[PDB]
Amino acid sequence: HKNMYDHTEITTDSLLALLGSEKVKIIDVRSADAYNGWRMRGEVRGGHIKGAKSLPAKWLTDPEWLNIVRFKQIRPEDAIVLYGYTPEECEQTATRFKENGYNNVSVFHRFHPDWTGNDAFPMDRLEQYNRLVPAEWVNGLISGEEIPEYDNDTFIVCHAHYRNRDAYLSGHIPGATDMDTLALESPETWNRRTPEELKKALEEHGITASTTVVLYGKFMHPDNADEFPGSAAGHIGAIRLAFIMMYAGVEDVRVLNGGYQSWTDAGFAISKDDVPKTTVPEFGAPIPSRPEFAVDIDEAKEMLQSEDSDLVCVRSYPEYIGEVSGYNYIKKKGRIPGAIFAECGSDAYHMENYRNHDHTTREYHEIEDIWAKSGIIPKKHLAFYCGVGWRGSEAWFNALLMGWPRVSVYDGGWFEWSNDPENPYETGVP
Ligand SMILES: C[N+](C)(C)[C@@H](Cc1cnc[nH]1)C(=O)O
Ligand SMILES: [Cl-]
Ligand SMILES: [Cl-]
Ligand SMILES: [Mg+2]
Ligand SMILES: [Mg+2]
């Protein structure tokens, strides 16, 4: 019946008439960063067609491509409409759908410049997308080239890791310097360090409050059998450090979307130099400048008693039901009573529910809709937490990117909560 290699074109008028159809799935095959709003071809309006889902053509080489599509609830009985910067970029995706039994597949040729160039055509974007940067933006930054969403004259690219300098020395973005997560958080409490420590640490790494800091980490397949599996979850650590730096007072913090893998996926050169630090004498702002980003245990207890506040438990399901603690250095098992569960992923060192297979952030509409089903909504003051505040920082960053007005991280997490034998806790399947 179908032709695997000749695809029907859908017109702008036809697509306009189908924008509200529940039987139609509009699929943006560009990069997730363009989908979020980055104007990667110089378009005046960035983002995606309103209601479109993100399925980057880059993922076509992934052997799990069909499961990704099914996990996104894109079904063979749906009418599939693909679009990219050009219709030619949609051809391989269209063929891939037809090869897997999707018989209703069309290609929209006029997204750019026709759709982007007229304000009558509805578009959407991740409100604070410029904090989540693509690899091309970082490459222009370190090359001293004109890049959008950047009006500063001072920057530093920071490769985060947890007591694992090999994560940096085995390959890093050229010119980048490494920051151990221990520089900004204490091994005694696994909370952010005191203001005086953060001031010294940031200065010794060459960071002022007015320095644009670009953070990223390297995913190295964490294994629960290792003594420090967090040494392999570099990009969670990067977002954890982004939280602490923004809390401290760094005005412009960016995160490389997808971490190190996005840098090498783009084909850019890597460096193995051990770049020395260029310290700065004065941070230049009071620390912390944004204390409302952090929540501690007394306020967290209040938020459990408030109508417009909630704690969001970003742990794994075995941790939530008290089957495991999730950590080799925590013996207590259980959960904070009254918190809203938002499953992070498989265990304490993986964020499958918040990431794509290439570690870029999951399509934010999916995060937003799943959160809303559990009452995790922006009208509340939300304190994301987990074991020790790493996974909660990554969840918190996703909400911050959506422009949510009062989102925090409860730093202490299950570690601090369970360390007080007076605190109530639950266990078992709810
Ligand atoms: C605070 N450290 C770095 C010790 C944590 C960080 C962490 C990563 N995923 C959940 N927590 C650890 O590695 O167990
Ligand atoms: Cl990671
Ligand atoms: Cl918990
Ligand atoms: Mg949208
Ligand atoms: Mg903590």
Determine the CATH superfamily of the largest domain.
Rhodanese-like domain
CATH first level of the largest domain: Alpha Beta
Shape: globular
Question: Could you tell me the radius of gyration in angstroms?
Answer: 22 Å
Give a short account of the largest sheet.
Answer: 5 strands, parallel
User: What is the correct CATH architecture of the largest domain?
Assistant: 3-Layer(aba) Sandwich
Number of strands: 17
β-strand amount: 5-15%
| Relative helix content | 25-40%
Helical stretch count? 15
Ions and ligands: N,N,N-trimethyl-histidine, chloride ion, magnesium ion
Structural account:
Residues 20-272, 314-426 form the Rhodanese domain. Mg(2+) 5 binds at residues 303, 306, 309-310. This is Sulfurtransferase. The relative contact order is 0.11. The longest helix is centred in the middle third of the chain and has 15 residues, at 234-248. Strand 11 (212-217), helix 9 (234-248) and strand 12 form a beta-alpha-beta unit. A 5-stranded parallel sheet has the order 1-6-5-2-4. Strands 8-12-11-9-10 form a 5-stranded parallel sheet. The protein has a 5-stranded parallel sheet with strand order 13-17-16-14-15. It has 430 residues and is α/β, with parallel strands linked by helices. It has 3 domains: 8-125, Oxidized Rhodanese, domain 1 (3-Layer(aba) Sandwich), CATH 3.40.250.10; 130-289, Rhodanese-like domain (Oxidized Rhodanese, domain 1); 292-418, 3-Layer(aba) Sandwich (Oxidized Rhodanese, domain 1), CATH 3.40.250. The protein contains 15 helices and 17 strands. The structure holds N,N,N-trimethyl-histidine, chloride ion (CL) (2 copies) and magnesium ion (2 copies). Residues 190-191, 388-389, 411-413 line the site of one magnesium ion.
